[PDB]
């Protein structure tokens, strides 16, 4: 689902 993994918190 995430597309920009580094933005995950």
């Amino acid at each position: 689902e995430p597309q920009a993994p580094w933005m995950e918190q």
Partner: antibody, heavy 117, light 112 residues
Framework: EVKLVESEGGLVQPGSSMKLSCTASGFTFSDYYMAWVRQVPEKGLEWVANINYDGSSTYYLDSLKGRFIISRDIAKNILYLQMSSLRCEDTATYYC??????????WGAGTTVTVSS | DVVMTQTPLSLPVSLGDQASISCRSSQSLVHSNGNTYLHWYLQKPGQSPNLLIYKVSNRFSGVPDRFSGSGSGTDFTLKISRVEAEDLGVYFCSQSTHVPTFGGGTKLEIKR
């Protein structure tokens, strides 16, 4: 077919502004995150910015100090990069790219921006 | 600030032989969600980069099985078997587990 085409780049005076655009085709535009990256001469590739499906969430390379704005027009299948207060160090080849599951799976042709008086 | 270090800077290979390129990251690329966001791109002369391998070992559409990606954690390798002349160009790795960064590239040179 899938394709990304950047607008013409070119010369801008230091301290001035400019906007790049990128037009997408072949896929459902709003079904994908999008990104800009740049290739600085004698240096490597560097992330610039990315944007989620509807444009409610963006990410920027920190060093940009909020001088750049990434945005997208769903009605027109267009991605923008607004660049303000340009300095010599912003001189580079800018690429727009489609972002999927953390990777860039479609790249544009690149457009060259030169900051100079 | 995650550094991607590629070696060698340039790699000469004979047609039909194998090329092996190393990419190392300064931090583990295993995301908290379990995925390793390490990818490989190829930029041919006069062209934009194209995706070759995503998430360590997955070949992107149209990439032949000659191209193989491997590794884990901080240590990764791209192997190109049976090299063809059209494979030449700059191979670079990239990570997006963390704030995204790119390796400096490895130039594949064809021997003749």
């Amino acid at each position: 077919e899938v394709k990304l085409v950047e607008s013409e780049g070119g010369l801008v005076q230091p301290g001035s502004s400019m906007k790049l655009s990128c037009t997408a085709s072949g896929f459902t535009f709003s079904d994908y995150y999008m990104a800009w990256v740049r290739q600085v001469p004698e240096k490597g590739l560097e992330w610039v910015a990315n944007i989620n499906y509807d444009g409610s969430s963006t990410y920027y390379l920190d060093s940009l100090k909020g001088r750049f704005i990434i945005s997208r027009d769903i009605a027109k299948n267009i991605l923008y990069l607004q660049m303000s207060s340009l300095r010599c160090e912003d001189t580079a080849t800018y690429y727009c790219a489609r972002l999927t599951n953390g990777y860039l799976d479609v790249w544009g042709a690149g457009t060259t921006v030169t900051v100079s008086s | 600030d995650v550094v991607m270090t590629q070696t060698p800077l340039s790699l000469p290979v004979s047609l039909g032989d194998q090329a092996s390129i190393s990419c190392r990251s300064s931090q583990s690329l295993v995301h908290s969600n379990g995925n390793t966001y390490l990818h490989w791109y190829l930029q041919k002369p006069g062209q934009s980069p194209n995706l070759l391998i995503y998430k360590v070992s997955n070949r992107f559409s149209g990439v032949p099985d000659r191209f193989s990606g491997s590794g884990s954690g901080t240590d990764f390798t791209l192997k190109i078997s049976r090299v063809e002349a059209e494979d030449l160009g700059v191979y670079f790795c990239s990570q997006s587990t963390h704030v995204p960064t790119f390796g400096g590239g490895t130039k594949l040179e064809i021997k003749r």
